Every structure is written in structure tokens, then in C-alpha cells.
Design a protein around this ligand. Structure first.
Ligand code: CUX
Lengths: 307, 625
């Protein structure tokens, strides 16, 4: 279908669109050529099989993070130092470079689209965070707040000027581009383990969660100052995605190659040993809220049914 | 021309990327050898049993290209000093794997970061790699002038950037290196790759890196300003640092993506090239020095040893030396021979240690321009040199010059002298034993006689050079005290070093020596005010001499006779380096010692801490009488 024959071994990203069609990011982290690729699968259960898919394209380089820009566009965190925007044609057969801007100085590691959907914020190993204009194809502002690699940036669900970030400098920063000093440190008292993953609560604008490198997921209420925390994983918490459910569930992924699903009080409901390598993403079906799809570096696309 | 390389942390195809890089003008590439994001598990099932190749094949380049064009890069997820045990353990295995792969490929160097204070386990692992056989690779420790925490934008509202000065705090990156290199026991395979930021620190912080083994300077694309035509350039302060770095012959590494997208990427490199071309060119002193920088040598002992033909030739090719000796003799003859006696009075002029005759010729050339008459004696103990004198004498000088083939202390003279002339001086003035010689030669000087030179003074200054300390440290030899190399002076063109205090005089001698009971033994105490934090590794020696009246010679930098490249400085090392904090005084003690066969130096530091006395009883170093 106009794409590569072989897709790269190491699956980085997995994101459902509002209608139910699966977005896939893949890089090759070993072998002769170290690049990546983008893939659309209108059949969720056909993935990751290449020739029986809706669309596909090769990127010059790997793919550390991506996310949807609405319904047609795909925002990409490259190893090249590029934020790139790829957008589908009207037929949804091709995937076309819309822009590719080489603005970070090291690998771009995390990206998250803001609530307007016309702006986005990327984070990198060069220690910077950048706010982008997706119409104009430019960096509006560039912020060096951290002292180490920026591990994760997450846009506020609804407020276009607010987002979280976290870094190997042990800081969790709440940003608010309206304030003249936009960043603000959210000390969890001690120098407790480094923050690895972030997720805003989708129904409470005051709440978020974060995972650490020691496998602990934590519940934070912005202002109060670390309500609760559970030792969910035995290794680094790679990602956190809240479900679209009314009182939502929290999927937690890790380098112990295990998915977990958690409730309001971070108690364990589901657990999946299905992957044999690192679990890199999670995305809940907007057509079936019991369904949850994970990718890994074992090249599996598992589909879990959650009670 | 500059030796310069490209840093990337993303290489999809080695083949193409290397070609692209060579095209742009770079000499080498810094790249990962496993994919930077490819985190690997070594203990936990299931991830540990991850199949597939762990990286790309060594077949992708020629062994030659691997040896010459590639600098390895530690993967940035490898954190041997994490607070999480599981990560420390993986990171150990990972570091080892990546380093053992670096050595497998035969890479000429391999980068590791110093980016926090505690690098103890990182040092432990690297060190262990170094002692797993005697393979020769280098390790470049990537360390920034300014820690990233101290250059962050002032944008966290509840955590502002400290606006007060912190003298010691601002040097903290130096101490990260110091701790790290101290732990690895001053390995010669561990050098610095110094990363330069957008805003430079205060001068003292940059001055800390004087003396350190900087093999590389990393310049991010982001630090480059833009001139009116859109090309990338650098601030004048950044240019100063680059000019300093070019004297250290460092390899320049360019890191980051292109920010000047209006122009292509060879421009950044072409700027450095332009800056290399446009330095102040190599002066008349620094043309000869080139080659001999921080190269340790034995000080000559032309008394005990007979100097070689090419050795005489070196110290002869120095016209400043002899025009000053000519001038000092010119002036002396006039002061002793009134114009009315310019034919009756013939001055008895003895060159003591005549070599192959350049001071004889300078003595002739001087007696011509003064229009006085001179009877010359040329004493030389080196019978090989005396061959050259007696051939000169028969072919040219006639019996104006009596050549005497003798030690000047053995010689019974036919007549007393009006002027004794000599060049028995070494880089520390008295280190060839000019005092002892001219004392034994004093009995055949007229009651009113002159010595040229009449006076010389040695000078000392404390220095920091972790480079030279290691250089000395490397002079261990079988069948002698394993610390002997530290208890002896070297002559050396001191280059990568920091002078910690103004030179101060140490030992002075006078000829003729009036003083009834003489004694050339000596004891001197010097106090050196030091205004920086630093590490003391030794004392540089220099000297000044008065030939006659205002006519002088000097290698003391502050009064150097311009263009006198003969004599390099001397270096007295010490065994253990001594921390010196800004405001402290370094007190050093020097003795000149002797018995009837040997003369030698001994020395110690007494402040801020005591060293051992170095070279006691001349056990490791003596100068032969
Ligand atoms: C000082 C005791 N004995 C003595 N007698 C005669 N000649 C002596 C000597 C000690 C050193 N020398 C001669 O002095 C010359 C001098 O060191 C020198 C070195 C280089 C040059 Cl280019 C000119 C002169 C040597 O020729 C040495 O043998």
C-alpha cells in the first residue's frame, strides 16, 4: 500500500484516533540502518502486519515519541533533533511530510499537543523545552529550565497555556506560559527518585500523576504537597495513560515488560505479562472502553480486555 | 589548519553520514556505537534474553576508518552512579559492553560525560576497563566550563537563579574532573573534552583548566552569534578562549544541529579556520620551541660530561648571546685601558670554557670595535672541542690565541688575567657549577681583575600542571628508586601550565668572590602569595646574569632577553601534588648542597602543607665536580 515492505523491529508508539483507527510509530534501534516509520491500521487486529494495513511511510531517522494532531496530522519526536509534522492526504493512503524542523540540539524525546490543537510543546536531551506553532511551522518560545535531559512533557487537557514537564534533574515543573516566570517546581519534599512519566487526570484539572525510575506511580493534587503512591512496577515507569471511562482507569507500563491497570486509589486491577520486551505505549479503544492496546520492543501488538 | 570533528547523537547510516561529514570538511566523527535510546537489560527476564543484534556490524567500515575517523560515545542512559541499585548494575554491564566494543573496533578515543558531582562508580568501572590488558585507547571526559544547573534560564518562579557570587561554587566542574581523574590514579588515557557554553564564566574558572590535559574543545552550534551577512561567528571573549585553545593544539568538536539554516554547515568550521589563520603568528622565540613543548630533558652537565659537537652547535646558534658578550667585553676594555695607552697596554683576557671558539671570536670582534690590544688564552677541558679550537687557531687566529687543553682548576697559568670570561651557566644559573669553577680559577685573576659574568641570580615560581606531573610520573625506570624521577630537575619548554606566583630570586653568586671564607652552599626560604584555587605540581626555575654593568642576559619571563632560545626553563617537581586555596601562601625551601665531589639541590614545601624533603644527600640527583 505505497509503504515499506518491512517495518522496523522496535515499536515506540500506539495511539487510537477518535474514530478507532490505530497509529503506530516504529524505530530500528539495532542493525545496519537506524531509522523509523509511521503506520495507520484501520484494522486494529491486523497490526503489526505490513501489507495488510491502511497506510505507511519511512522517516529519515528514529521515532522517540509521536502524537495525533487532531485527526489527519501526526506530530513526531525524531532522533535527528527534528520535530516533524506528517499529515495524511484526503484518501488516507499516503502520509506526507508537512514540515521537518531541526531546532533541538540533541534527540527530541517527548512531544505533546496543546488544547487548542494549533500549538504543541516538545522536550529533548539538549535540556530544552520548546513551544511550537503548528500553522506557522515555528518555535514561538524556547525554554532552558532544566539541568538534565527532559524525559517527558504533557499538555494540559483544556488550558492551552499549561503543561507539565519532568527531567533527570529530579524536577517536576508545572508551566503556565501566562506567568512572566512560566515554570514552577512541585517539590515532593525529599530528593525522591527521578520522574520518568507524566499524565494529567482527564476529569480533574487540579490533578496529575507521575511515575519514577524505581517503579512507583504517584498521585499529585497540584497545590496540597504527593497524596498517595504505589509500588506498581519493579522497574522504570515508561508511561501512564488514563482511560476514557467516566471514573477512569490508569494504564501503567514499564521496563519490567508488564502492563498494569489501576483505580482511584492506585490499587492493581489487571496485570499483563504478555510482552517479552519493554512496553512502550498504551492506548484505549474509543469504540470499546474495556479494550486496551499495547506495543513493545518485542514487536507485539497485544489487545487486553479490562474488567 | 585546524584538526576538527563532528558530534552527532543520530546516525541512521554510517556510510552516508561519514561521507556527508567528510564532505563538510571534518577530520573525524563522534557517534554512538549502540543506538542512544536502545536501553538493554542484563539481569531481569524477560528483557535480558532480548534477541537480535545488539548493534550494527564492524564490517560497515574499514579497520582503518574505525582507527582514524571514529570517536565512540557512551550511551546517555548509562548511569553507573544512579541511586537505584537496579540501574547501577545494568549501567555497569552496559558501560563495560560499550567500552569493550570501543576497543574491539580499535577506536582512537571514546567520550564519557562528567555531568554530576558523584562519578565514583563511573570512575571505578572505567578504571577497571583500563586495567583489563594494555590496549591503547583514549578517554575524553566531556565536562562543561559551566555546569548546566548554573546556566539555566531564570524562569522557575519558586527557585530563582542565585544572583550572588560563589567563587568556589563557579569552579565546581573543575573539581568534578579533579575527583574523577584522582580516582582513576592519573591515567594517561584519560583526558578532558571541555564543553564551552553560550555565556562564559569569570576568568578564574577558565584559568582552572590551565595545566589540565585538554585534548578537545566542544563548541555547540547554539553559542555562535550571527554577523550582518548571516554567517555564524563568535563573541570576542569566545575568540580569546579559542586563541588560547589553539596554542594547546586541541581538536575542536562541533555539536548540535544547524541553527543558521540560511547557510550550510561547513561555515562553522570555516570560521575556526579563519580564526586559526588570523592568530598572532609564531614569534622568533616560539618558532624554535615548537616540537619541545612540555618535553622533559636532562639538564646538561658540561663539567662532568663532554658535550657533543651538535650540542655545541645548538647553544652557539644564538646571536643575542654573543653580541651581549661582545658588548660587555667592549665596554670593559675601555674602562680599563685609557685612550692614551691604546697601544702600550695589552689586556690579558682568558676565556674559561671556550667550547669551539664563539666567545673567543666575540672577544676578538669586541677588541676590534674598541681599538684596544688583547692577549687571548682559550681554556677548554673537552679535548673533542679543543680539536676545533686548535684547527681555528692554526687556520685563523695565529698566536694571538693560546689554546690551553685543560681543566681550569688544574691549570697553572703563565701570567695573571685582567679579564676572565665564561659561559658556565645553566637554566638555573648555578646548575653547571659556574661558582665552583670560577672560584678555583680566581687565583689567576689580577688583584684588580674583572669576571664576565660578574653576577647571576636564579629565580623560582610555583606552578600547576597536571600534564607535567604525569609526564614526570611516567619517568619510572627499573633498577632505581621508583620515585627518583620526582627528585630531580628537568629542563623543559614549559607550555601547558599555570604560573601561580611571581618569580622570586633564589640563589645569587658574585665573581670575583671577595668574601674570605666563601662557601657556595646555600639555604633560602621563599613565600609565594597565591590568589587562585589550584593544585601545585612543581617549581619553575629561571635565571638572570650580569655580564658587565647594564649588559645582561635573562630567561626570567618578565625580563627575558628577547630572542634567546638556547635556554629553556628548569622544572623541580614534587612527589605528591598539594591543594592550594585562593589567598594561601606557598612556602618553599631550597638548599644548594655539596661535598668535594658532588653538588646538588634539595627542596621542600612547608606551606600550606609539608612535603617530604626532595633529593636528600643527592640520592636521586647530583651534579659532578
Ligand atoms: C669549571 C671546571 N672545569 C672546566 N674547565 C675547563 N672547561 C670547562 C670546565 C667546566 C666546563 N668547561 C667547559 O665550559 C664550556 C661551557 O660549559 C660551554 C657550553 C656550551 C657552549 Cl656553546 C659553550 C661553552 C664547555 O665547553 C665545557 O667543556
Amino acid at each position: 500500500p505505497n509503504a515499506p515492505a518491512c517495518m522496523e523491529r522496535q515499536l515506540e508508539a500506539a495511539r487510537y484516533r477518535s474514530d478507532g483507527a490505530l497509529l503506530l510509530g516504529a524505530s530500528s534501534l539495532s542493525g545496519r540502518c537506524w531509522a523509523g516509520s509511521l503506520w495507520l491500521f484501520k484494522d486494529p487486529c491486523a497490526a503489526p502486519n505490513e501489507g495488510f494495513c491502511s497506510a505507511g511511510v519511512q522517516t529519515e531517522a528514529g521515532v522517540a515519541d509521536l502524537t495525533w494532531v487532531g485527526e489527519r496530522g501526526i506530530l513526531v519526536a525524531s532522533d535527528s533533533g527534528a520535530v516533524e509534522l506528517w499529515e495524511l492526504d484526503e484518501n488516507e493512503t499516503l502520509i506526507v511530510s508537512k514540515f521537518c524542523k531541526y531546532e533541538h540540539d540533541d534527540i527530541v524525546s517527548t512531544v505533546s499537543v496543546l488544547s487548542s490543537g494549533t500549538q504543541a510543546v516538545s522536550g529533548s536531551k539538549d535540556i530544552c523545552i520548546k513551544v511550537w506553532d503548528l500553522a506557522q511551522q515555528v518555535v514561538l518560545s524556547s525554554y532552558r529550565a532544566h539541568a538534565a535531559q527532559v524525559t517527558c512533557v504533557a499538555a494540559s487537557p483544556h488550558k492551552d497555556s499549561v503543561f507539565l514537564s519532568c527531567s533527570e534533574d529530579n524536577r517536576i515543573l508545572l508551566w503556565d506560559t501566562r506567568c512572566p516566570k512560566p515554570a514552577s517546581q512541585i517539590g515532593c519534599s525529599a530528593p525522591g527518585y527521578l520522574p520518568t512519566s507524566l499524565a494529567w487526570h482527564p476529569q480533574q484539572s487540579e490533578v496529575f500523576v507521575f511515575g519514577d525510575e524505581n517503579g512507583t506511580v504517584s498521585l499529585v493534587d497540584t497545590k496540597s504537597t504527593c497524596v498517595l503512591s504505589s509500588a506498581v512496577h519493579s522497574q522504570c515507569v515508561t508511561g501512564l495513560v488514563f482511560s476514557p471511562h467516566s471514573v477512569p482507569f490508569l494504564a501503567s507500563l514499564s521496563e519490567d515488560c508488564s502492563l498494569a491497570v489501576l483505580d482511584s486509589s492506585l490499587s492493581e486491577l489487571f496485570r499483563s505479562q504478555a510482552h517479552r520486551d519493554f512496553v512502550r505505549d498504551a492506548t484505549w479503544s474509543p469504540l470499546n472502553h474495556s479494550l486496551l492496546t499495547t506495543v513493545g520492543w518485542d514487536h507485539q501488538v497485544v489487545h487486553h480486555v479490562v474488567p | 589548519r585546524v584538526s576538527s570533528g563532528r558530534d552527532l547523537n543520530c546516525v541512521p547510516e554510517i556510510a552516508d553520514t561519514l561521507g556527508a561529514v567528510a564532505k563538510q570538511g571534518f577530520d573525524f566523527l563522534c557517534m554512538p556505537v549502540f543506538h542512544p535510546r536502545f536501553k538493554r537489560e542484563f539481569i531481569q527476564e524477560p528483557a535480558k534474553n532480548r534477541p537480535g543484534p545488539q548493534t550494527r556490524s564492524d564490517l560497515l567500515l574499514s579497520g582503518r576508518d574505525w582507527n582514524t575517523l571514529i570517536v565512540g560515545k557512551l550511551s546517555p542512559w548509562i548511569r553507573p552512579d544512579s541511586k537505584v541499585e537496579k540501574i547501577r548494575r545494568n549501567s555497569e554491564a552496559a558501560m563495560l559492553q560499550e567500552l569493550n566494543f570501543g576497543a574491539y573496533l580499535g577506536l582512537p578515543a571514546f567520550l564519557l560525560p562528567l555531568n554530576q558531582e558523584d562519578n565514583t562508580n563511573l570512575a571505578r568501572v572505567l578504571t577497571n576497563h583500563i586495567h583489563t590488558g594494555h590496549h591503547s585507547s583514549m578517554f575524553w571526559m566531556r565536562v562543561p566550563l559551566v555546569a548546566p544547573e548554573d546556566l539555566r534560564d531564570d524562569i522557575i518562579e519558586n527557585a530563582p537563579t542565585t544572583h550572588t557570587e560563589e567563587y568556589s561554587g563557579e569552579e565546581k566542574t573543575w573539581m568534578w574532573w579533579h575527583n574523577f581523574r584522582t580516582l582513576c590514579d592519573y591515567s594517561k588515557r584519560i583526558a578532558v573534552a571541555l564543553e564551552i557554553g553560550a555565556d562564559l564564566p569569570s576568568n578564574h574558572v577558565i584559568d582552572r583548566w590551565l595545566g589540565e590535559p585538554i585534548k578537545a574543545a566542544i563548541l555547540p552550534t547554539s553559542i555562535f552569534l550571527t554577523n550582518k551577512k548571516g554567517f555564524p561567528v563568535l563573541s570576542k571573549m569566545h575568540q580569546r578562549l579559542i586563541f588560547r585553545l589553539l596554542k594547546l593544539e586541541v581538536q575542536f568538536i562541533i555539536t548540535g544541529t544547524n541553527h543558521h539554516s540560511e547557510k550550510e554547515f561547513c561555515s562553522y568550521l570555516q570560521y575556526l579556520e579563519y580564526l586559526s589563520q588570523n592568530r598572532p603568528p609564531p614569534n622568533a622565540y616560539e618558532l624554535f620551541a615548537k616540537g619541545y613543548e612540555d618535553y622533559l630533558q636532562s639538564p646538561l652537565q658540561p663539567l662532568m660530561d663532554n658535550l657533543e659537537s651538535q650540542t655545541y652547535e645548538v647553544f652557539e646558534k644564538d646571536p643575542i648571546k654573543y653580541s651581549q658578550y661582545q658588548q660587555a667585553i667592549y665596554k670593559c676594555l675601555l674602562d680599563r685601558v685609557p685612550e692614551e695607552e691604546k697601544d702600550t697596554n695589552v689586556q690579558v683576557l682568558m676565556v674559561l670554557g671556550a667550547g669551539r671558539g664563539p666567545l673567543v671570536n666575540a672577544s676578538l670582534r669586541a677588541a676590534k670595535q674598541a681599538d684596544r690590544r688583547i692577549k687571548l688564552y682559550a681554556v677548554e677541558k673537552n679535548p673533542n672541542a679543543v680539536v676545533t679550537l686548535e684547527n681555528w687557531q692554526f687556520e685563523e687566529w695565529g698566536s694571538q690565541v693560546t689554546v690551553v687543553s685543560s681543566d681550569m682548576r688544574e691549570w697553572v697559568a703563565p701570567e695573571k688575567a685582567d679579564i676572565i670570561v665564561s659561559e658556565l651557566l645553566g637554566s638555573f644559573a648555578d646548575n653547571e657549577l659556574s661558582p665552583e669553577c670560577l672560584d678555583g680559577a680566581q687565583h689567576f685573576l689580577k688583584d684588580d681583575g674583572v669576571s664576565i659574568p660578574g653576577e647571576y641570580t636564579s629565580f623560582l615560581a610555583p606552578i600547576s600542571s597536571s600534564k607535567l606531573y604525569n609526564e614526570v610520573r611516567a619517568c619510572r625506570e627499573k633498577d632505581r628508586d621508583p620515585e627518583a624521577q620526582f627528585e630531580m630537575p628537568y629542563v623543559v619548554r614549559l607550555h601547558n601550565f599555570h604560573q601561580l606566583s611571581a618569580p622570586q630570586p633564589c640563589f645569587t653568586f658574585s665573581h670575583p668572590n671577595r668574601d674570605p671564607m666563601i662557601d657556595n652552599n646555600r639555604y633560602c626560604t621563599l613565600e609565594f602569595p597565591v590568589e587562585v584555587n589550584t593544585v601545585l605540581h612543581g617549581f619553575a626555575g629561571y635565571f638572570e646574569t650580569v655580564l658587565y654593568q647594564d649588559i645582561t642576559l635573562s630567561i626570567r619571563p618578565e625580563t627575558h632577553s628577547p630572542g634567546m632560545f638556547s635556554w629553556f626553563p628548569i622544572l623541580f617537581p614534587i612527589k605528591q601534588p598539594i591543594t592550594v586555596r585562593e589567598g594561601q601562601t606557598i612556602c618553599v625551601r631550597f638548599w644548594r648542597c655539596s661535598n668535594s665531589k658532588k653538588v646538588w639541590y634539595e627542596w621542600a614545601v612547608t606551606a600550606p602543607v609539608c612535603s617530604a624533603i626532595h633529593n636528600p644527600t643527592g640520592r636521586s640527583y647530583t651534579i659532578g665536580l
